[PDB]
Amino acid sequence: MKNFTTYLSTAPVVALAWFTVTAALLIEINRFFPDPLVFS
Amino acid sequence: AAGSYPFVPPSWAPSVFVPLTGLVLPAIAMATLFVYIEKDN
Amino acid sequence: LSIAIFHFSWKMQSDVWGTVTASGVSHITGGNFAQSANTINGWLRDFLWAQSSQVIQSYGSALSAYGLMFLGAH
Amino acid sequence: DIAGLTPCSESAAYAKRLKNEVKGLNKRLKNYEADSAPAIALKATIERTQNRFANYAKAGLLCGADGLPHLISDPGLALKYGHAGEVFIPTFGFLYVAGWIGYVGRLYLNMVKGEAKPTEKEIIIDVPAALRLTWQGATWPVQVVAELRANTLTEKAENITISPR
Amino acid sequence: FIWLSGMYFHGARFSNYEAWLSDPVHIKPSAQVVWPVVGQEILNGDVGGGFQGIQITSGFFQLWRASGITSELQ
Amino acid sequence: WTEPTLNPDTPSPIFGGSTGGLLRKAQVEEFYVITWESNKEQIFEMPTGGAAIMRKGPNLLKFARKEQCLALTTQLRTKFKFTPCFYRVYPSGEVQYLHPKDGVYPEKVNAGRPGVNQNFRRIGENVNPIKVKFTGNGTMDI
Amino acid sequence: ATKLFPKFSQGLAQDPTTRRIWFGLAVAHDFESHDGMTEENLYQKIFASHFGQLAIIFLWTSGNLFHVAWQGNFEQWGADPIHVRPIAHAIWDPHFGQPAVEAFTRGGASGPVNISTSGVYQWWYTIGMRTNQDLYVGSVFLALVSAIFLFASWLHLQPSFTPSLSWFKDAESRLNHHLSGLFGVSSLAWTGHLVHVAIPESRGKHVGWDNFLTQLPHPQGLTPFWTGNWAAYAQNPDSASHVFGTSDGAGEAILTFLGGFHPQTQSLWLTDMAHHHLAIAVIFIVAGHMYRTNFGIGHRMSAILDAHVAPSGRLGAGHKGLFETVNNSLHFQLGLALASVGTICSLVAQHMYSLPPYAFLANDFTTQASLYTHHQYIAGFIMCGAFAHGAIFWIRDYDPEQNKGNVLARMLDHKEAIISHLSWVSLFLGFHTLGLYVHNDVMQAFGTPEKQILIEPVFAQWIQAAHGKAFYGFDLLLSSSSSSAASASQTLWLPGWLDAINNNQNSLFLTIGPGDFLVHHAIALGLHTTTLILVKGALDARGSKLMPDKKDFGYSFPCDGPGRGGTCDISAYDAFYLAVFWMLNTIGWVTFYFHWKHLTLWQGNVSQFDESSTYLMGWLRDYLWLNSSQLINGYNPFGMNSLSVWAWIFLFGHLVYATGFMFLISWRGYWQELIETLVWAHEKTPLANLVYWKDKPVALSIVQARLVGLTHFSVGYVFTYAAFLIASTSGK
Amino acid sequence: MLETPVTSTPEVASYLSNLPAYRTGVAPLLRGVEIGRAHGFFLPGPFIKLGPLRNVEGAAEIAGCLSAAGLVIILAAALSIYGSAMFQGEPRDPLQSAEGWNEFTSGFTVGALSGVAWAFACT
Ligand code: CLA
Ligand code: CLA
Ligand code: CLA
Ligand code: CLA
Ligand SMILES: CC1=C(/C=C/C(C)=C\C=C\C(C)=C/C=C/C=C(C)\C=C\C=C(C)\C=C\C2=C(C)C[C@@H](O)CC2(C)C)C(C)(C)CCC1
Ligand SMILES: CC1=C(/C=C/C(C)=C\C=C\C(C)=C\C=C\C=C(C)\C=C\C=C(C)/C=C/C2=C(C)CCCC2(C)C)C(C)(C)CCC1
Ligand SMILES: CC1=C(C/C=C(\C)CCC[C@H](C)CCC[C@H](C)CCCC(C)C)C(=O)c2ccccc2C1=O
Ligand code: SF4
Ligand SMILES: [Ca+2]
């Protein structure tokens, strides 16, 4: 597990995770607060 | 040599200048240069 | 390969694909491959430019994804 | 007002853009039975459209004859006339997150520098320490200035390699 | 295999194969449905057959038909 | 050591022939002749294209490029650990012993070699082009 | 054996390959490199070469006048300039088929002819020319001038008439003479044409060489000028009812400041153009009397440059030690000249569309479009040369020890700062300018146009309101009459500037929308990027971590080998080579914005541009695709019309453009080895082996192919667009 | 370079040696009239049947042989400049010499135009 976690830390894996979370966050934000053209 | 301006080209000028400049003139230039370019030193 | 796919796209739309009507068939392009393909302009005016209308006007329709990809591809 | 930009609330074209756009979806709803998922969906698109085409006007979005909302960039114009929510306020929001991301990155870089083989902590990222530095960038503006007023944000010009002139 | 299996699954749950079977001519094949977000739901066009998705061009519906597949349980 | 003299009657390796060898330059301009001494009859690869059976003892092959001869030279010096030597036969017959032209293959230092093209300054101590402008002389050579 | 073709380069002369022929044409006008070149001889050769270029320009102009007179419709077009189409020349094509002979008979002729888009007609009318004789006389005159310059090239190259290097390095005087004589006495001289010939001709009154010494330009005469009452020359201006070339509505003024444009011609008034040249001429002559000569009173340039050092030492030694740098470097001077000429070449295009300076120029849309695009492109090539020669200066003629602490040496000190900061601006402009186009395109595709981001160009609208534009409603400066500036000009050009600026049928300060905002920022991206490429090459011209000895390797060298990873395109010639592409991309966007903004203006569908431009899809379908419909139909399986040549050129441009790719995508090696096989085949082929090549066939040089492909690439981009810009504007 | 059945068949190595170019011995002019007529007579063909006025009556053969004559003359000039740019030092076969080529070119120009006339007299 020490070496599996090392692999899950490599750049390609970490970037895949970080982006997925960021993408999902934006998607979910528009899902509940849609059409955000202005900050009102 | 007629009307007002005495140097108005004749109607056959195009039927001579265009043929000469584009077929005859270029051939002379290309051939003359070719000889100079290949001219030995 | 590009010319081959263009040759198939145009030949077929012009000489095969169409609707069988009473006495005659209506080809997608009305059988213009023969006289319009012997020149490079015909391949641009009667093929590229003429058939590019659908993709350039796909915006706003279910096909709008292809218009976006068409430019993205360029 | 501003540059001949009429408010979308008073913009007739904006109203037509609503009428014609909801009609184009109320003609795609007819070719479907009242309860089909196709129809539940097209009715949501009509509701969402009718909400957006009103949230915008209620936000006082000036739009031209086109009927499409326009944004004001000048801080004075945006502030003086209550158009700060567009561009102005959004500007700082990005700047804060942008500097946050950059500051956290440099914090990590300068920690792995020195540490054993700094080159192998850039490929196999130290997710633990990377997760202990993310929140440190929340008050990045406070820390960044404290570094300018201490000469530690930049490097001395006699320690940076330069190409032969 | 994963790719092939996914095609059958997408053609099992999110597809109009059964509707197409009854009227193959006037119904366009579709087996890709987009989520209703960022107005991307426009991509779900009326392929006919009580279905709003993306017209596929992979020839799988006609392949399944010639395999006998007559339901989304197969 | 005495600059070896070419024996133009040296058995040549066995090869059917290739559309990739000498052209008009060999006669109008010049050509080169590599020679070596094998221990056994072995197949080698020609720097021009193909395979050839080298003969036992003296061998002689002709090329139209020095790099081609040197290529075979390194091949023999490495694949067969031979010590090949090549010349430059001009159209008049003037053979010029090209390699090693000393007996000691270039890589090895040997007293009796003068220093040619040797600047005794750091590459970054060369003058500016303006100092050699209108002088028709390179900054490195000056 | 050794050849003679490359007389200047003995190395090329001794080259056994064919490269000697190719390079012999390239390294031909780089005398600084010629074998046995002295600085004085270089200057004398350049000075004579200048005369040769001046002979070509005048000979070129004479030919245009001759063909317009011998094969043109000037008098007919002059009678009806809003219906007759100016004829450039006749098409004597021994290959034309009968339908081609019929379709190209237009503009009123008896044979196939070519309508002109140069706009010489409108210009020659405005300046006084009315008949074909005026053209014949002018052509002969200019032809004689060309002959004179040609003799001068010979005279100034023959001992005793060859200027010394000292004369070539006499700056103070040269500038004084050029500013007072070349610029000033040539502007007052022009006012003399206008006041005496152009203005009278526009008011219907032949004042030619036959009656100029007897025709009073002004009714009062020189009396008002002598008495100081100069105002008399600005009374009774031509009324709005005036018709160009007619006494109808004609006035008596010779020099005035009405502003705006003549009503019928829709072009700047002649009197306002007369007083302009008079005013500028006075300034130029006075400015000419500044530098020192051989009398005493005057300014030594060196002193001025050395006396300008910031006391805070922020600019180091300031401009001290720069006079010699500019005076002893012919690349530094050429770069400044190209930069100045380039920038002014653009002013001509930006100020000639807004303010038509010639009669009936606006009416001719095709001319207007083809003139903007011509100058804007020529300007771009000139700018590339400016930086190009600047990089050559850094390597061939920069003394790092003399320029020590001067503003020029403290530039390389912060070379990274300048280059890196140009990188950030380019990225910022690029990431955002494009992002707000894709964002709008997505909204257009998803049928959510309201959601698309449309930022308003408020900053530009205010500069427009400041000039008097009222549409915006900002009431700023001229927009507000109660202002100081507005009230001050109210008695001069103001009354006209407004009438004209507040008319939407012309191009004076056109209404800008959010569509213009995006394209303007895109133009900035091209300006910054193209600049970054050239600036990076100029600063790294003689230095770089990868190639610290670039100066020793000269300016144009292929690469430093595959060593250090890759040195491909590392020479400062390759910053030019690459910058050219970005320059074409930048100008492409600017000349496409002009054309669409104006085609929509001329067709009356301004909303078309005000909406389609917001998203990129509109630019392609509504502009390139929609307008190309006619051009492509120049020749179809049913027939051909007068737009056949443009359709043929349009495709021809694509061919040359694509051919350029091979020389850029493919590299020297596959071709070289291929040529080797070809050489073998010919030597073996019987009956053909008899004939042989004198020069050994070799593949194009690494740098050579770069320029050959780029010339093909550029020629295409020009012909392909010239075809569109002219056949789409004319077709309607 | 690789003696192949093709580039060795004594029949084909003999056919080549009777062609008026490998037949060294015949005076270069007579080795030019031979080659000239051979390359000149067949030239009119392509212009007579597929040229601009190929479907006009009577003037389809005069125009073919007139055009051919034109090219024949063009071919002559190229032959001449070739010798001038190849025999600067007037480099066995006298054809491969300065004077040799100047007499071959002339034989070709007077043989090809004679062949072009033979083809018109054969229509
Ligand atoms: C990014 C560059 C930029 C640009 C091109 C402009 C451009 C403009 N700004 Mg501005 N502004 C900027 C940055 C910029 N601003 C920033 C960073 C701030 C925050 C400090 C402001 C805060 C600001 C204010 C408070 C106001 C402007 C205003 C204006 C407009 C007229 C003011 C002027 O003459 O000059 C530019 C002025 C400034 C840059 C700041 C000084 C404030 C000005 C001088 C007071 C002028 C008030 C008066 C009503 C303006 C008359 C405009 C005319 C059409 C009637 C003008 C189009 C005026 C406006 O039109 O709003 C109603 C105004 O009131 N700006
Ligand atoms: C800690 C990461 C980091 C930071 C703080 C910066 C900071 C900077 N970069 Mg940079 N850059 C980065 C990463 C980073 N970069 C990476 C990974 C690349 C390769 C794609 C680049 C490529 C790049 C270029 C080509 C340029 C800059 C430029 C700049 C300067 C202009 C400011 C700007 O707008 O940012 C610009 C940032 C970018 C253009 C792209 C980077 C954006 C990424 C997403 C941020 C990095 C996040 C990082 C992975 C977080 C690590 C966290 C850690 C726990 C693992 C600026 C000081 C410009 C410059 O030199 O100014 C003179 C410029 O020309 N950067
Ligand atoms: C009154 C004295 C005088 C005058 C009139 C000139 C004039 C000239 N000199 Mg000169 N010179 C002088 C004194 C003078 N010199 C002295 C005393 C010296 C000794 C130091 C020199 C040393 C010298 C050198 C070494 C050189 C010159 C050169 C030149 C020519 C520049 C090339 C050109 O075309 O410019 C023309 C520019 C204008 C006429 C005005 C510029 C206006 C801009 C560019 C555009 C304006 C366009 C307008 C707005 C609209 C036009 C519309 C329509 C007409 C198209 C030019 C004709 C160069 C040369 O020989 O070229 C052949 C050059 O090499 N001179
Ligand atoms: C359509 C073709 C094209 C495009 C789009 C570009 C674009 C660009 N060129 Mg360029 N160029 C081209 C052709 C092109 N060039 C050609 C044919 C040549 C001749 C060889 C050159 C020669 C050239 C030179 C010499 C230079 C440039 C430079 C630049 C950059 C200028 C700075 C900028 O605007 O940053 C803006 C950034 C963008 C527009 C990128 C958009 C953001 C990306 C696409 C999103 C991130 C990825 C996304 C999420 C998904 C994609 C990846 C995913 C699949 C993983 C820019 C990105 C300059 C440079 O390098 O900058 C320092 C420069 O030096 N170019
Ligand atoms: C008001 C405002 C705008 C006004 C802009 C105007 C008028 C002027 C702008 C000047 C600007 C934007 C910038 C000048 C910057 C100059 C310097 C020297 C600053 C450099 C910043 C640096 C070096 C910091 C880098 C960072 C550090 C060290 C750590 C982290 O913070 C990350 C990072 C990289 C940010 C407009 C355009 C209208 C629009 C509306 C917002
Ligand atoms: C041709 C032409 C042109 C060109 C031009 C140029 C470039 C130049 C010219 C020039 C000229 C042709 C000029 C004129 C001159 C004349 C004169 C100049 C005369 C005068 C007279 C008198 C009598 C006066 C005297 C005096 C003076 C001088 C000074 C003061 C005093 C007095 C007044 C006494 C163009 C292209 C535009 C187009 C059209 C054609
Ligand atoms: C095609 C190609 C060749 C081969 C191209 C050759 C050999 C050019 C052949 C041209 C012949 C001679 C005909 C050209 C016709 C010209 C239009 C004639 C006039 C050209 C000038 C005199 C103006 C290269 O050598 C090369 C080298 C490096 C990078 C890319 C390439 C590359 O792409
Ligand atoms: S590929 Fe060509 S340009 Fe690149 S390093 Fe090698 S030789 Fe030089
Ligand atoms: Ca007159």
DSSP code per residue over G337-365: HHHHHHHHHHHHHHHHHHS--STTTTT-H
Q: Give one DSSP letter per residue of G245-261, joined into a string.
A: TSSTT----SS----S-
User: Which residue has the least CA distance to atom 34 on ligand 4?
Assistant: G430
G614 in helix, strand or coil? coil
Q: How far apart are the first and last CA of chain H?
A: 46
Closest CB from D28, D36, D45 relative to E50: D36
Per-position b or e across F73-103, b if 16+ CB within 10 A of its CB: bebbeeebebebbbbbbeeeeebebbbbeee
HSE-CB at G454 with a 13 A cutoff on CA atoms is 29
Task: Compute the distance between CA of residue C5 and CA of residue D75 in angstroms, rounded to an integer.
Answer: 55
Neighbours of chain E (3+ CB pairs under 8 A): A, C, D, G
Q: CA H105 to CA G453: how far, in whole Å? A: 76
Cα angle at F87 between F81 and F92, to 5 degrees? 160
Q: Compute the distance between CA of residue F90 and CA of residue F107 in angstroms, rounded to an integer.
A: 27
Give the whole-angstrom CA distance, residue D153 versus residue D144. Answer: 7
CA distance G328 to G402: 12
The ligand minimizing its distance to the Cα of G19 is 7
Cα dihedral G610, G614, G617, G618 in deg (nearest 10): 0
Contact call for F and E: 3+ CB–CB distances under 8 Å? no
List the single residue in G1, G21, G94 with the smallest CB-CB distance to B37.
G21
Residues with CB under 6 A from ligand 4: G 423, 426-427, 429-431, 434, 525, 529, 532-533, 578, 581-582
Cα G716 to chain centroid, rounded:
18
Parallel, antiparallel, or unpaired: how do β-strands C25-27 and C18-20 relate? antiparallel
Q: What is the resolution of this structure in A?
A: 2.8
Q: Which of residues 399-418 of G touch D (CB under 8 A)?
A: 400, 412-413, 415-416
What are the CB-based long-range contacts (under 8 Å, 24+) for G675-678? G675/G699
Q: Which residues line ligand 8 (CB under 6 A)?
A: G 558-559, 561-562, 566-568, 667, 702
From C41's Cα to the closest Cα of chain G, the distance in A is 7
Q: How far is the CA of G193 from the centre of ligand 6 (A)?
A: 7
User: Is G367 strand, coil or helix?
Assistant: helix
DSSP state of G13: H
Alpha helices in G540-572 (DSSP H): none
Q: Rounded distance, CA G463 to CA G337, Å?
A: 30
| Ligand 2, atom 17, residue with closest C-alpha | D105
In one letter, which amino acid is G291? Y
∠ Cα F16 F19 F20 (to 5°): 105
Distance CA F89, CA F64 (A): 10
* CB-based burial label for B26 (10 Å; 0-12, 13-18, 19+): exposed
- DSSP state, C33? H
Spatial CB neighbours of F99, under 8 Å, sequence gap ≥ 6: F69, F70, F73, F84, F85, F86, F105
F100: preceding bond cis by omega (within 30 degrees): yes
CA atoms of D57 and D50, how far apart (whole Å): 11
Distance from CA of F3 to the nearest CA of G (A): 31
Q: Report the Cα F26 to chain-centroid distance in Å.
A: 15
Q: Quick one: which of G500, G501, G481 has its CA closest to G491?
A: G481
Distance D140 CA to ligand 5 centre (A): 14
First to last CA, chain D: 55
Closest CA to G397 of D164, F129, F135, F126: F129
Among G690, G692, G693, G694, the strongest candidate for a mutation testing the H interface, having the largest count of H CBs within 10 A, is G690
User: Which residues of chain G make contact with D65, given a CB cutoff of 8 A?
Assistant: 607, 610
Q: What angle do CA B19, B23, B25 make, to 5 degrees?
A: 95
For residue F135, the 8-state DSSP code is T
Question: G528 near G622, Cβ under 8 Å?
Answer: no
Please give, one letter per residue, the 3-state secondary structure of G483-498. CHHHHHHCCCCHHHHH
DSSP string, G73-92: -HHHHHH-TTTS--EEEE--
Using the mean position of ligand 8's atoms as its centre, give its distance from the Cα of residue G560 in Å: 8
Which residues, including other chains, have CB under 8 Å from residue A39's CB and lie 6 or more apart? D85, D86, D89, D90, D93
Report the pocket of ligand 1 as residue ranges, CB < 6 Å. Answer: D 74-77, 80; G 458-459, 462, 465, 474-476
Distance from CA of D138 to the nearest CA of A (A): 17
Distance of alpha carbon D13 from alpha carbon D17, whole angstroms: 6
| φ, ψ (nearest 5 deg) of residue E37 | -150, 165
Task: Report the SS3 class of residue G291.
Answer: strand
Grouping H, G, I as helix, E, B as strand and the rest as coil, residue E65 is helix
G113-115 vs G635-636, strand pairing mode: unpaired
Q: How many Cβ atoms are within 10 Å of G7's Cβ, its own excluded?
A: 14
Query: What kind and span of H or E run contains F38?
Result: strand F31-38
One-character DSSP codes across H51-102: STTSSSSSTTTHHHHHHHHHHHHHHHHHHHHHHHTT-TT----GGGSHHHHH
Distance CA(G326)–CA(G311), nearest Å, equals 24
User: What 3-state class would DSSP assign to B40?
Assistant: strand
> What are the CA-CA distances from residue C44 to residues C47, C49, G625, G626 (Å)?
5, 6, 11, 14
Q: Report the residue count for chain D.
A: 165
Residue G663 near residue G700 (C-beta atoms within 8 A) = yes
Structure determined via = cryo-EM
> Do residues G425 and G535 touch, judged by C-beta distance below 8 A?
no
CB < 8 Å from G in window 65-104 of D = 65-74, 77, 87
How would DSSP label each residue in G398-436? --TTTSSSBTTHHHHHTHHHHHHHHHHHHHHHHHHHHHH
Is there contact between B and C if contact means ≥3 C-beta pairs under 8 Å? no
Contact indicator for D92, D53 with CB cutoff of 8 Å: no
Contact G569, G580 (CB under 8 A): no
- Rounded CA-CA distance G101/G95 in Å is 10
Q: Give the Cα separation of D104 and D131 in Å (integer).
A: 10
User: Which of G18, G26, G732 is CA-nearest to residue G8?
Assistant: G26
Count how many residues are written for chain F: 142
Which tokens is G607 given?
């909303």
Residues of chain G in contact with residue D75, where contact means CB-CB under 8 angstroms, are none
Alpha carbons C16 and G101: distance in angstroms, whole number: 39
User: Both tokens of residue D98?
Assistant: 């942008």
Residue bearing the CA closest to ligand 8, atom 3: G568
Give E37 to chain A, closest Cα distance, Å: 6
Per DSSP (E only), the strands in G74-172 are: 87-90, 113-115
Give the count of Cβ contacts less than 8 A between chain D and E.
19
In D41-68, which positions are buried (b, 16+ CB within 10 angstroms) versus exposed (e)? bbeebbebbeebbebbbebbbbbbbbbb
Alpha-carbon span G278 to G255, nearest angstrom: 9
Q: Of G546, G589, G550, G592, give the one whose Cα is nearest residue G571.
A: G550
Cα–Cα distance for residue pair C6/C48, rounded to 1 Å: 9
CB G631 within 8 A of CB G640: no
**Considering Cα of D25, then D27, then D28, then D34, what sign does the dihedral take?**
positive
Q: Which residue has the tokens 């060859």?
A: G162
| Segments in G156-194 forming alpha helices (H) | 165-168, 171-177, 186-193
Is E43 buried (19+), middle (13-18) or exposed (0-12) by CB count in 10 A? buried
Cα gap G514→G510, rounded to integer Å:
13
Q: Is C64 on the interface with G (CB under 8 A)?
A: yes
Cα G621 to Cα C54, G122, G632, distances in angstroms: 11, 34, 15
Whether residue G386 contacts residue G335, with contact meaning beta carbons closer than 8 Å, is answered with: yes
| Helix or strand holding residue F52 (H, E) | strand F51-54
Instruction: Report chain C residues whose CB lies below 8 A from the CB of G639.
Output: none
**What whole-number distance in Å separates Cα of residue G164 and Cα of residue G154?**
16
Query: What contacts D12, CB < 8 A, 6 or more positions away?
Result: D67
CA distances from G625 to C65, G17, G24 (A): 19, 47, 44
Residue F65, CA atoms < 13 Å, CB-side half-sphere:
9
Long-range CB pairs of G404-408 (<8 Å, 24+ gap) are G404/G317, G404/G321, G405/G316, G405/G317, G406/G316, G406/G317, G406/G318, G406/G319, G406/G320, G406/G321, G406/G322, G406/G325, G407/G315, G407/G316, G407/G317, G407/G318, G407/G319, G407/G322, G408/G322, G408/G325
Contacts of G179 (CB under 8 A, 6+ apart): G284, G287, G288, G290
Residue linked to tokens 């992002």: G435
CA contacts within 13 A on the Cβ side of G154: 5
Tokens matching residue G653: 């441009």
- Chain A neighbors of E38, CB-CB under 8 A: 27, 30
Cα–Cα distance between G449 and G454 in angstroms, integer?
A: 10
Task: For strands D6-7 and D62-63, give the pairing.
Answer: antiparallel
To test the pocket of ligand 4, the residue of G582, G586, G710, G714 to mutate (highest count of ligand atoms within 8 Å of its CB) is G582
Compute the distance between CA of residue G359 and CA of residue G126 in angstroms, rounded to an integer: 6
Residue keyed to tokens 């804007």: G376
Residues of F in Cβ contact (< 8 Å) with G395: 129
